[PDB]
Amino acid sequence: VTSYTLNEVVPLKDVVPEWVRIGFSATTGAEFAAQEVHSWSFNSQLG
Amino acid sequence: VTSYTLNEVVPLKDVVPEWVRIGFSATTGAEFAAQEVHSWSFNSQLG
Amino acid sequence: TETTSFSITKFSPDQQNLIFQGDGYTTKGKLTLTKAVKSTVGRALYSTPIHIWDRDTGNVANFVTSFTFVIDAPSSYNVADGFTFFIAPVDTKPQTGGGYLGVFNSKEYDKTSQTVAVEFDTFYNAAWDPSNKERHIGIDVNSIKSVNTKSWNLQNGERANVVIAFNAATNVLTVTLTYPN
Amino acid sequence: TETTSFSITKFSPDQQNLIFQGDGYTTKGKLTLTKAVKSTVGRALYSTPIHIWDRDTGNVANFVTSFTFVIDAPSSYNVADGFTFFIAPVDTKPQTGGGYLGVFNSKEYDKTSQTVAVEFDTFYNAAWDPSNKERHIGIDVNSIKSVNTKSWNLQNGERANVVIAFNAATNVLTVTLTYPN
Ligand SMILES: OC[C@H]1O[C@H](O)[C@H](O)[C@@H](O)[C@@H]1O
Ligand SMILES: OC[C@H]1O[C@H](O)[C@H](O)[C@@H](O)[C@@H]1O
Ligand SMILES: [Ca+2]
Ligand SMILES: [Ca+2]
Ligand SMILES: [Mn+2]
Ligand SMILES: [Mn+2]
């Protein structure tokens, strides 16, 4: 098992609007690959 | 505390489409009233 | 496996996750569907499509919902017209008003309807409502005529706690309503 | 209090709760964003608006997501271009492709962007990517230039388990990636 962790302070209230959508993005160009999600789960609690 | 329970067999697979929206409805006519939801929570698990 | 869940204990002024139809709107942290006015309809839907069953596996979903509401009448002999929690096709729009409660159009079973509604009926429509002339909780399928009812005593102005659960192994839909006192 | 939650462990052929943009689609129970073709963009969004903070209380939401993905390259020296999980304005549309990964348009901080992206970058764009020329996990805010990175060794074809969490008391966003072996 090979894990990698990164973390940072982002101040969300100031970057993004009160209401947002969430999702996934990918791209190829000159070179390429296939990128695929096999499962996705999410939970948030505001207030 | 005053409770009332009703129950029945509904065969959902046959009444409704695979994908549905859920919600609340109210109406007045000749007579009337104010109807109001103060809180709402939902959970389903398919499969 | 796909699950889904939510909880709003206080409504914003721009609930962007809701669809409002007819006279529904949010004020004071409540969702208000009809104000005490004559002849009006109020509908509010949660916008994500819920996947309630599957062509490919033939599975049906278990589910439960719970909410809180009050009906506030000028008195107890002038109370109309009701309130429904329903499950409908995704493009649902408000149907016929008054005693049809915004979700149906006849008492004749209409298969095109595709709507299951649980109702809290405050007014006897002689033509389909229980002859005992009582206020009632009812389960209706594809028709304004409940396939089953329970008579309940409106406590005008109190906050009712409702829980609705459906069990997919048993095909049983249950409703319980609680008053505090 | 408004909470929200979901889980899809297998994707339907008509995920009606998803928005597909560019080349995204579902097949075989997987969500596929780009096939191994030249020059294409794939985006998929969850459709309900998530309420991430509040004008009136000034609260921000805590949240966590976790997913599984694989990148499948013809070899390991021909691998492009990346993959992102992002948080964006509700009307988001796909931006510039290739090394900009579908969510941005410059390396210059653009406030109008309003996008937080976590990226899994498989190709060095000399102009903004870490000079060490390594594949990396990065956190970017309003720009294709990560404000912070970690170099990671693509295991072409394996299934990565990702968890992203954000803590609203601390304003810290964390990313961990796990390979099985
Ligand atoms: O496929 C890798 C690269 O191909 C093309 O040069 C695109 O312009 C560039 O943005 C991309 O990163
Ligand atoms: O307000 C109570 C009643 O008023 C009007 O007669 C409407 O036609 C009827 O459907 C409704 O039930
Ligand atoms: Ca009636
Ligand atoms: Ca790059
Ligand atoms: Mn009735
Ligand atoms: Mn990069």
Curated annotation (Swiss-Prot), chains C, D:
Residues given in the record as Ca(2+) binding sites: 121, 123, 125, 129
Binding locations of D-glucose: 81, 99
Residues involved in Mn(2+) binding: 119, 121, 129, 136
Annotated site (Cleavage): 180-181
Protein name: Lectin beta chain
Source organism of the structure: Lens culinaris (Lentil)
From-to range in the entire protein, with total length: 31 to 211 of 275
